[PDB]
Amino acid sequence: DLYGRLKSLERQIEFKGIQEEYVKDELKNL
Amino acid sequence: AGGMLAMLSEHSTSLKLHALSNLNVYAQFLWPEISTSIPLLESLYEDEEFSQRPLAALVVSKVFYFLGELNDSLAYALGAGSLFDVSEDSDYVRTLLDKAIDEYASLRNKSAESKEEAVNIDPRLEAIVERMLEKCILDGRYQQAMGMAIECRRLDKLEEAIMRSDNAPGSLAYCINVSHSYVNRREYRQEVLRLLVRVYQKLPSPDYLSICQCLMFLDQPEAVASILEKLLRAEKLEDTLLSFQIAFDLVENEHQAFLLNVRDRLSERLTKIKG
Amino acid sequence: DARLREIRSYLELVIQEKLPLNHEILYHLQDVFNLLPNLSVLELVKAFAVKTNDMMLVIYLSSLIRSVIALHNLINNKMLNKE
Amino acid sequence: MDPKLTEIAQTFERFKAASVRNDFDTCTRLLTQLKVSLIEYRSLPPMFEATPNAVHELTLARDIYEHAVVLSVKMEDQEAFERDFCQLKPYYTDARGRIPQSTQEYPILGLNLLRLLVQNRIAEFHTELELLSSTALENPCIKHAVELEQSFMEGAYNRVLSARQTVPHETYVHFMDLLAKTVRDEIAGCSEKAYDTLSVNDARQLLLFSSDKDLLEYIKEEHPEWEIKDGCVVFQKSKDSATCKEIPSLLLINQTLSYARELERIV
Amino acid sequence: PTLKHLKEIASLLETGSYTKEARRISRAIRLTFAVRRKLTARVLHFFLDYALTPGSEAHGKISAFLPELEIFCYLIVLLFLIDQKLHNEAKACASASIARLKSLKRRVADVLASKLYSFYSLSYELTGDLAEIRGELLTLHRLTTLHHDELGQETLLNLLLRNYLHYNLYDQAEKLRSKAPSFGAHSNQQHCRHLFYVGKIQTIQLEYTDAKESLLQAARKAPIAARGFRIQCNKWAVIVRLLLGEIPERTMFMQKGMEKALRPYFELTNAVRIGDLELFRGVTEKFSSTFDKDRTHNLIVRLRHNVIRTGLRNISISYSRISLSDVAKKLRLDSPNPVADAESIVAKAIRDGAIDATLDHGNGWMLSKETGDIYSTTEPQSAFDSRIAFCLNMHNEAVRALRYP
Numbered sequence A: 001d002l003y004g005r006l007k008s009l010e011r012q013i014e015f016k017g018i019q020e021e022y023v024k025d026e027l028k029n030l
Numbered sequence B: 001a002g003g004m005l006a007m008l009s010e011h012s013t014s015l016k017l018h019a020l021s022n023l024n025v026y027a028q029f030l031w032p033e034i035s036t037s038i039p040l041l042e043s044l045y046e047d048e049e050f051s052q053r054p055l056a057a058l059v060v061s062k063v064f065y066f067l068g069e070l071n072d073s074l075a076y077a078l079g080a081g082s083l084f085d086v087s088e089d090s091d092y093v094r095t096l097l098d099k100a101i102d103e104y105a106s107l108r109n110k111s112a113e114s115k116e117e118a119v120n121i122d123p124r125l126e127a128i129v130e131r132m133l134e135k136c137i138l139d140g141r142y143q144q145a146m147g148m149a150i151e152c153r154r155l156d157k158l159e160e161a162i163m164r165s166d167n168a169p170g171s172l173a174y175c176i177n178v179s180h181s182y183v184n185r186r187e188y189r190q191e192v193l194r195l196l197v198r199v200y201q202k203l204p205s206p207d208y209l210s211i212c213q214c215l216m217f218l219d220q221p222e223a224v225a226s227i228l229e230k231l232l233r234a235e236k237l238e239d240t241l242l243s244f245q246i247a248f249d250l251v252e253n254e255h256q257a258f259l260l261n262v263r264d265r266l267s268e269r270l271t272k273i274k275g
Numbered sequence C: 001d002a003r004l005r006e007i008r009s010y011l012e013l014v015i016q017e018k019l020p021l022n023h024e025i026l027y028h029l030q031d032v033f034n035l036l037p038n039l040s041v042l043e044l045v046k047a048f049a050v051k052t053n054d055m056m057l058v059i060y061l062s063s064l065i066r067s068v069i070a071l072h073n074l075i076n077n078k079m080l081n082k083e
Numbered sequence D: 001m002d003p004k005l006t007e008i009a010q011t012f013e014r015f016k017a018a019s020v021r022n023d024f025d026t027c028t029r030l031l032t033q034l035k036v037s038l039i040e041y042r043s044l045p046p047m048f049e050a051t052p053n054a055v056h057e058l059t060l061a062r063d064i065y066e067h068a069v070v071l072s073v074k075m076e077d078q079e080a081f082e083r084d085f086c087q088l089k090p091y092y093t094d095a096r097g098r099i100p101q102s103t104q105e106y107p108i109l110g111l112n113l114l115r116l117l118v119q120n121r122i123a124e125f126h127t128e129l130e131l132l133s134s135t136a137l138e139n140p141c142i143k144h145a146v147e148l149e150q151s152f153m154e155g156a157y158n159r160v161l162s163a164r165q166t167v168p169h170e171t172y173v174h175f176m177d178l179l180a181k182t183v184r185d186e187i188a189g190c191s192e193k194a195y196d197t198l199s200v201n202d203a204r205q206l207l208l209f210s211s212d213k214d215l216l217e218y219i220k221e222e223h224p225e226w227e228i229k230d231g232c233v234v235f236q237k238s239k240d241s242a243t244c245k246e247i248p249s250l251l252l253i254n255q256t257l258s259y260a261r262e263l264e265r266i267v
Numbered sequence E: 001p002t003l004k005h006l007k008e009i010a011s012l013l014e015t016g017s018y019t020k021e022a023r024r025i026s027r028a029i030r031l032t033f034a035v036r037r038k039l040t041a042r043v044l045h046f047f048l049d050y051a052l053t054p055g056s057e058a059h060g061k062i063s064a065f066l067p068e069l070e071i072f073c074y075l076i077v078l079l080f081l082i083d084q085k086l087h088n089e090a091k092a093c094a095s096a097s098i099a100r101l102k103s104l105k106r107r108v109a110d111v112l113a114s115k116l117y118s119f120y121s122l123s124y125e126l127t128g129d130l131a132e133i134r135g136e137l138l139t140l141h142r143l144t145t146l147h148h149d150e151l152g153q154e155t156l157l158n159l160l161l162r163n164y165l166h167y168n169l170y171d172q173a174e175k176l177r178s179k180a181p182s183f184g185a186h187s188n189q190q191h192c193r194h195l196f197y198v199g200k201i202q203t204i205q206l207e208y209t210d211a212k213e214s215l216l217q218a219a220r221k222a223p224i225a226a227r228g229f230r231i232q233c234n235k236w237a238v239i240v241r242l243l244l245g246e247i248p249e250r251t252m253f254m255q256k257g258m259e260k261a262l263r264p265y266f267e268l269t270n271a272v273r274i275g276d277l278e279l280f281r282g283v284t285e286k287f288s289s290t291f292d293k294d295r296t297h298n299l300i301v302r303l304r305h306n307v308i309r310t311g312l313r314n315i316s317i318s319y320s321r322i323s324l325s326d327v328a329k330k331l332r333l334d335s336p337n338p339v340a341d342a343e344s345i346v347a348k349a350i351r352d353g354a355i356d357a358t359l360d361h362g363n364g365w366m367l368s369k370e371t372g373d374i375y376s377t378t379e380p381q382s383a384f385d386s387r388i389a390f391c392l393n394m395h396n397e398a399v400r401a402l403r404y405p
Helices: A004-017 A019-029 B002-008 B013-025 B027-046 B053-067 B070-079 B091-113 B123-138 B142-151 B155-164 B168-181 B186-202 B208-217 B221-233 B237-252 B256-265 B269-274 C002-016 C023-034 C042-082 D003-021 D027-043 D054-074 D078-093 D105-119 D122-131 D140-154 D157-163 D170-194 D200-207 D212-222 D249-266 E002-019 E022-034 E041-051 E057-064 E068-083 E087-103 E109-127 E137-146 E150-166 E170-179 E188-204 E208-221 E227-244 E250-254 E259-274 E278-286 E288-294 E297-318 E324-331 E338-352 E381-401
Strands: D197-199 D227-229 D232-234 E321-323 E357-360 E365-368
Touching: A004 A019, A004 B142, A004 B168, B002 B013, B002 B027, B002 D027, B002 D054, B002 D078, B013 B027, B013 B053, B013 D027, B027 B053, B027 E137, B027 E170, B053 B070, B053 B091, B070 B091, B070 B123, B091 B123, B091 B142, B091 E137, B123 B142, B123 B155, B142 B155, B142 B168, B155 B168, B155 B186, B168 B186, B168 B208, B186 B208, B208 B221, B208 B237, B221 B237, B221 B256, B221 B269, B237 B256, B237 B269, C042 D249, C042 E381, D003 D027, D003 D054, D027 D054, D054 D078, D054 D105, D054 D170, D078 D105, D105 D122, D105 D140, D105 D170, D122 D140, D122 E297, D140 D157, D140 D170, D140 E338, D157 D170, D170 D200, D170 D212, D170 E338, D197 D200, D200 D212, D200 D232, D249 E381, E002 E022, E002 E041, E002 E068, E022 E068, E022 E109, E041 E057, E041 E068, E057 E068, E068 E087, E068 E109, E087 E109, E087 E137, E109 E137, E109 E150, E137 E150, E150 E170, E150 E188, E170 E188, E188 E208, E188 E227, E188 E297, E208 E227, E227 E259, E227 E297, E250 E259, E259 E278, E259 E297, E278 E288, E278 E297, E288 E297, E297 E324, E297 E338, E297 E365, E321 E324, E324 E338, E324 E365, E338 E357
Parallel strands: none
Antiparallel strands: D197 D232, D227 D232, E321 E365, E357 E365
16 A cells, blocks of 8 residues: 555644644643 | 846747747746746736737746745646646646645535535646546556545546556555545545445445445445345355355444344345344 | 713713713813823923833843843753753 | 848848937837847847857847837836846846957946936945946946946035036936936935025025026925025925934833833733 | 774764764764865775775766765765865766765755765866856755755755855845745854855845844854854954944954954954045055955945045034035045035935034034934933843743743
8 A cells, every 4th residue: 555654644643733732731721 | 037038028929938938948047037027927928819828827837936935836837728737757847736736625625614605616726636636547556546536525536546446455445444544524434435335336246245334334224235135135155155244244343223224124044144 | 992982972962962961070071181181291201211211221131131040041951951 | 041030130220220210119110129029039038049040149139139228218218228228138247258248338337327326226236336347347438427426425416417518428318317307306305404494596506507497496396395485495394303302202102012011921 | 094084984974874863974074074184095995995895886986086875985085176176076076976966865865965065066166167056056955945855955045145146146146035945043054154145145235234133143153163254254244334334343353363354354444433535545455455355345335435424423523513615625535626525425414314413505614413412312222222122032032932941
C-alpha cells in the first residue's frame, strides 16, 4: 500500500491537533 | 528586462504576445521586474480581442507563483486553459496541482454541508482534477487515485479506479480501511460503502463476506437475506459452507436487531442457518 | 456615555412635549455641563505633557530594571541547563 | 536578410519621416506604430536570442525606443515617456556589451534625470547617476542635469531659471518649463512658511514674475489663501505649526493610554 | 597529523550522519576549516582514497580536478582550488559538486550543500561570473524552498541580495525582500548578512529609520572574528548615522583591530560634526579612492546636504542673528552668488524645520528662534521615550517569553 502512509500521517496529525485545546484547558484549570 | 514590458505596451497585439512569451521563458529569473507590471498582463487577459489570452494568463500565474500567492496563481492558471499541461514535471505545475486538489476538496466539502448553497465549482478546476485522476490511473497508482477520489468526494472516479486495478481485492480492502479511518462523516461513509457493495457485485468472484460486512454497516438486512438465499439454493457444497461461514461471521458482530430482521426475511440447510 | 444618550433621549421627549422634568434634576444636568472644564487649556496642556513625560520615564526605569533582572535569570538558566 | 526586418526598417523610415513632419497620428500613426512595435519587440525580447541577426535587431530596437521617447516628449506625455524609457533601459543596461554606444544615450538619460528632478524623485535621480559611468557624467547634457540638481538643492532657483537659457537641446525646453513651474511652487511654499507678510515687489522678485498681473494671476489661481493687503502678500501662517509642543492634548495623552494598557494587559 | 585530523573529521561526519545531528556536521566543518591552512594535495588525495573507494565515478572526477562523504570531499578540494587560486577548476568542481547535489535526496545534505552554495558562487566572483549564476542558484533556492530546507532557504536568498547588489540591481534587490519569507534565525552569520543586506539596501533606498535597526541588527549579531563583516556592518552603520543626522560616537572608532578600517569614516563625521564642507572635499578627495572601494560613494554625495545642515546646526544655535551673506561666507560656498544661495539655503532649512529661525530679507538678516530656554522638551520627549520603553516591555517580555522558569 502507498496511499496509507499519507492517510495515517494525517490521522495522527489531526489527533495531535486536539492536544492544543487539551493542554489549554489544563493551563487554566491548573 | 524593461524591453519586453515596453513591447507589451505597443498596439501590435501579436508582438505584445511574443514579448509575453519571451518573459515566460524568462519568468523564473525576471519575476521581480514583471511583478511591477501585473496590471498590464491582467488587462491583456481581460481583452476579448486578444487571441493569445491563455499565454498572458500563464505568465501572470507564474509571477504569482514566485510571489507566493498560490490562490491568484491558481485562478490565472485556470485562465490559461490548454497551456497548463498536467503532464509537465515542473515544480510550478506540482505545487499548483496540489493547491488545486486542496481547494477542490475544500469547496466539495463545503458544498456538501450547505445543502442550500450550491457553491459554483469552476468547471476548469474539475477538469484539472479529472486529468490528474486519469494520469494516476494510467500510471498504475490506483491507491493514490482512490485517496484523491475520497478527498474530492467523487464516487464515479473511485469506481473507475477500482475496476481498472490489477489487484481488485487488495484495492477494495484498502478502500474499506481508508473509509473507516479517514471518513469522519457518517453520510459520506455510507455512500462510499453503497458504492463498494455495487462494485463487489460486478466482480466474477464476489467476496460475499466483504459484501455482508459492508451491508451490515449500511443496516440493509434485505440484501444480506437475498445473498444467503442465493447461496443456499446453489447446488455446490462450497457455496453452502460459505453461507454458513457468513452466518457465523455475522453472529460474531453481535448486531441482534440486524440478525433477527435477516432471519425473519428468510423465505434442512435453512434450519441449520436459522440455528 | 449611555447616561448622556439617555438624557438626550429625554430632551427629545421634552421637545415632542410628552414628559416634563423635576426642576432639581434638570438643574443637576445643567450643573454638570457648567462645571465642564475647558479641555483646550494651553498651560494645562503643558501640564499634561510634563506629567506624561515624568510618569512614562518612571515606567522606563521599571522596564530597564526588569530587563536587568530577567536577563540575569536567563543567564542563570543557561548555567543550570549546561551544568 | 529577413524580409520582416526589411519591411520593419521601411516602416521605421516612414515613422522618422512622419516625426520630421510632426504628424502625431493618422497614416503617420500607422507607420510609427508598425516600425516601433516590430523593432522594439525584436531587440528587447527578454529572451535576447544569440541569433546571427540579433545585433541588428537590438540596435534597431534601441533606436526605436529612443525615437519613441523623443515623440513622447514632443507630445508632452510623461506617462508614455516613462513607459518608453523604462523599456529602453534594459537595452541600455544588459545589451551594452553587445551593441555600439548610441549618440542619443546621454541626452535621453539626462532628460530622464530632469523628469525625475521635476517629479521630485531625487532618490531615483541619484540612483540613476550612480548607474552612470564617469564618462557619461562628463557629457554636456548629463552635466547640465547634475548642475541643475545642484542649483535646485542649493535653492539657487535664479540659476535654474537662468540656465533655462543655456539649454543645449530643444527637447528639454518642455521639462525645463515644467521645472520652472515646480520651482515657483516650491518658492511659494517656502515663502508662506517663512514670512508673515511679503511686499508685492519682493514677491515678484523671488518668483521672477515679469509683470504685476503675472504675480496677481498666479496668486489668484494656485494659492487663493493668500491675502493682498496694502501692496503686501499676507501669508496666513498656520494656527500652530512652527512652535513645538503646540498639538492636541487629549490625543497625545490617549496615545499614552495605548502604550500603558497594551503594555500591562500582557502582565 | 594532517591525515589523522582528516580521518577524525570524516569519522565525525559519519557519526553525525548516523545520528542525524546537524551540530555534529557543524563541528566537523569547523575542524575542516581548522585544517585549511595545512591542506596538502598528497594528503587530500590520500583522504579521497580513504573515504572514496578506488574506481568510484565520484572518486575519479574528484581526482581529475587535482552522499555526505562524496559531497564532503568536494568541500575541501573546492576550497583548496581557490586556496591555490585555481578558480577555473573550482568553477567546474563547484558545478560538479552541486550537480551531484541535485541528484541526492537527503535532508542531511543541507549543511554540506549550504556551505557549497557559499563556495559555489565564490568561485564565480573570483572568475567574474556572478551574472551567469542567476539562472543557476535561484532554482537551487527553489529546491531548498521546495524541500522546506530552512538552512538553504536563507543562505541562497542573501547571495541573491549579494549578486543583485554587486550588479547594482537595486531596483530589483528590494524586489527580493518584499517576497522572501522571514526564515528563523537558524544561521548566526547568514542572517546577519540577511539582516545586513537589508541594511545596505535600506541605506541605499532612503528607508534610513529601518536602515539603522537592520544595520544594527546584523551588527548586534556580528561575530567578533568577522571583523571585516563587523567593519562592513560598522562601515554602513556609520554612513546612515551621518545620513540620519546623528553623528556616530567616537567610541565605535576606537574598537580594537577595526580602527584602521574606519579611519576615513571618523574624519568624515568630524567635518560633518564641525559642519564645514571644505575639509569635506579634502577628506573626501583623499579617500575618494578608498570610498570607491566601498561603492558607498553615492551615499557620500548626500552627506554634504546634511553637512550643510550640520554647519546650519552650529550657526543657528550658536548665533542669534546674522545676515544671509554671513550665512554663506562661514559656510564657505564657492557659489558665484552666495547672497541668494544662503538665502535660498535657509529657505529649505526653514521649510525643513531644521532650525527654529526666521529670515529678514528686507534687512537680509536671519532670526534663529530663541532656541535656548524655549518651552517644554515634552510631547516629543514623552513620545520618543515610549517607543523605547515599549520596546523594552516587549524586549523584557522577549526575555520573559524566553523565560523557562
